[PDB]
Amino acid sequence: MFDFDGYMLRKAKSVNKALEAAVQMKEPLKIHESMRYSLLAGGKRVRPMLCIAACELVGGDESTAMPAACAVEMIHTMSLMHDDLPCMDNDDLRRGKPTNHMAFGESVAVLAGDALLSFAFEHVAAATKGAPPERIVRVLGELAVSIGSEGLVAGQVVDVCSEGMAEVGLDHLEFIHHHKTAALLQGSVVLGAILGGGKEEEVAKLRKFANCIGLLFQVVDDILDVTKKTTYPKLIGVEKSKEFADRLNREAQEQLLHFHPHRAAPLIALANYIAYRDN
């Protein structure tokens, strides 16, 4: 497409605007002040974009998807919030700024993350308009599975229980990546499509598309750290790792072969972007 960055930048703005609205300061002020700190921190907003793109993909309307889009960013934000905690990664910084618990303490960091997770469902259940309750509830179930013990959290649990064993196989590595990364991307894209009135067939392709680009990200990210513990290169070598990445990008792009060429452009574009990054 022309101007893929402009696209993503537009999506990011419309989303950041909505995020500001959604989570306003209020009593108790520290719990909210913490939520905004990590949530409105300004980032790429890939998940929210994947959600909206998926919706519009099936004649959906961005308006109808904005709440769910915000929802997936809320989860991501809170995963990252808890992730930086002392009992886990213990990071004092993130993007050049003090991490959340360092600014408000561990208690607030924990709680506010929790606040974002439950609010994620609230906002979707109560703010989502232009879709029948059967659709919304359904979409809520999907978000649920994408972040539970068969998704995000599953991936983040095996990862912390794996820092002990240094003998990890492609099997173990790909699980950690599918759950700790593609799971949420899978959710995002599926929410947009359902709320957009997408047929089950359409919804299934998108689920795959996401999984490919989800894996794609971690692979290409592994390749780069070499052309600049376990990694795709230590396991199959760069040459091979690249082979995989291209297959992953090729496959993802096929899933979108039948939707309108024009409505599919953004995703195809995000796919390539994930493959041909210099960093």
């Binding site: 009593e27 108790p28 520290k30 719990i31 909210h32 939520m35 809170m78 995963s79 808890h82 905690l85 002392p86 009992c87 886990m88 618990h101 303490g105 561990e106 208690s107 607030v108 924990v110 709680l111 506010a112 993350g113 929790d114 606040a115 997770l117 439950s118 609010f119 469902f121 609230e122 259940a125 109560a126 029948p132 309750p133 059967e134 919304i136 509830v137 359904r138 809520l140 179930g141 999907e142 978000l143 649920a144 599975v145 972040i147 539970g148 013990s149 959290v153 599953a154 983040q156 649990v157 095996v158 912390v160 229980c161």
Partner: protein, 256 residues
């Protein structure tokens, strides 16, 4: 009464054990299971089923919800017990035992909470036609009671209680926010899923609020001892007054 609240805690525990099945990877579900049941039961779940059968509904109709409520309680209970290094959260002497570590508890708590909504959304019987709106409303009620304006809000303020120097007015609030909101949510949901009208739903919703605020008020008494009775009375009065036979006057067994 006595064995009624039992078959309830049981039919709920059973439904949970039938839903959280230890399996691959035993590293994820190993904790998801232990922590879900290592958490004391919450009257909110009990109240949820009770309210359903009160309005005339079948117990199962509000089983997913009652399960949803315990999960949220459970998850939150775990998190309020995680050991913190910066001492931002005052050290509560009732130090529970930690089988798993801080990183696994935290993540499990983040796994349990969504599981509640999964169960909810995933319990929609397509043969029933009011199932969609009734559950969508309950998801709102539950997530909203566990969110920043409710439970979370109570958990936060609780950390401001100096013990020997904290009025009862303040404690009641913390209890209203920590338990009240959830219990309110509880009866309210049981009634919605029950098929109750706005009139009943509200009345049952108010009772729960006062009911939960009284229960946690009892929890608090354990530690600090400004255990007034002019407060236990006020609450039960307002609770009972929120009842305009047995199930219709059994909910009034927790206030005696």
């Amino acid at each position: 009464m006595q064995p009624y609240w039992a078959a309830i805690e049981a039919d709920i525990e059973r439904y949970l054990k039938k839903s959280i099945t230890i399996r691959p990877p035993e590293t994820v579900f190993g904790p998801m299971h232990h922590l879900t049941f290592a958490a004391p039961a919450t009257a909110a779940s009990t109240l949820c089923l009770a309210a359903c059968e009160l309005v005339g509904g079948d117990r199962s109709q509000a089983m997913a919800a009652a399960a949803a409520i315990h999960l949220v309680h459970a998850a939150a209970y775990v998190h309020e017990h995680l050991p913190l290094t910066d001492g931002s959260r005052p050290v509560s002497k009732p130090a529970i035992q930690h089988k798993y570590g801080p990183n696994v508890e935290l993540l499990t708590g983040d796994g349990i909470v969504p599981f509640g909504f999964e169960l909810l959304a995933g319990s929609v019987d397509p043969a029933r036609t009011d199932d969609p709106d009734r559950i969508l409303r309950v998801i709102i009620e539950i997530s909203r009671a566990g969110g920043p304006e409710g439970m979370i809000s109570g958990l936060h303020r609780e950390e401001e209680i100096v013990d020997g120097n904290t009025s009862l007015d303040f404690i009641e609030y913390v209890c209203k926010k920590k338990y009240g909101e959830m219990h309110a949510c509880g009866a309210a949901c049981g009634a919605i899923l029950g098929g109750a009208a706005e009139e009943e739903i509200q009345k049952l919703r108010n009772f729960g609020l006062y009911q939960g605020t009284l229960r946690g008020m009892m929890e608090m008494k354990n530690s600090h001892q400004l255990i007034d009775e002019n407060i236990i009375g006020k609450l039960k009065e307002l609770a009972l007054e929120e009842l305009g036979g047995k199930n219709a006057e059994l909910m009034s067994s927790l206030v005696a």
